[PDB]
Design a protein around this nucleic acid. Structure first.
Length: 134
RNA sequence: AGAAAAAGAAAGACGAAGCACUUCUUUUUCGCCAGGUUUACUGUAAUUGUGAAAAGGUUGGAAGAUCUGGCCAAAGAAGGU
């Protein structure tokens, strides 16, 4: 950060967050806000990704839903990808059991991509059927 | 694979500026097949038909011969009168 490293500093922040920086139900958002400006919308998406990893505040399901809604609204590739993926992982808002055919298929029909990111994660944890059709 | 993050892109209806501001809701990226859905028609093989050039006197059956003298040649390859 004294090397003014927007990039390398957000890098180290994701690094330590994965390397077990505290979560503490507040340390999550603490490190995330610390990383959020970092001259990079991608850096804020990386903060949100390390956040979804450290599931302290990530258990706010509709909150991850709204954050990723604004993200995939603004067309943030890294944000939509990491957020929605680890969201479906921590059972946050990416699908359902009665509106999953809408939710997941709409994350794909968002735009032309995050379809391949579903193939990265979300299609893997599809769970949009217990069948073979979907 | 070992565990040692990853790396991506379309239109339509809705508010708005009479479009774009993006926010919700569906849309497709050929292994090799096969008609077709009209082509912006224009530069880039060729066939066949066309494809130029003045007159006079002489002998002879008849001139292309002859004497006098002009014209074409990217045609003086040839073939008949």
């Amino acid at each position: 950060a004294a090397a003014a490293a927007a990039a390398a500093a957000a890098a180290a922040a994701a690094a330590a967050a994965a390397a077990a920086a505290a979560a503490a139900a507040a340390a999550a958002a603490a490190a995330a806000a610390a990383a959020a400006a970092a001259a990079a919308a991608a850096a804020a998406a990386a903060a949100a990704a390390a956040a979804a990893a450290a599931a302290a505040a990530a258990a706010a399901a509709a909150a991850a839903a709204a954050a990723a809604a604004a993200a995939a609204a603004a067309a943030a590739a890294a944000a939509a990808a990491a957020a929605a993926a680890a969201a479906a992982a921590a059972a946050a808002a990416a699908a359902a059991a009665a509106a999953a055919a809408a939710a997941a298929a709409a994350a794909a029909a968002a735009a032309a991509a995050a379809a391949a990111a579903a193939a990265a994660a979300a299609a893997a944890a599809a769970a949009a059927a217990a069948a073979a059709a979907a």
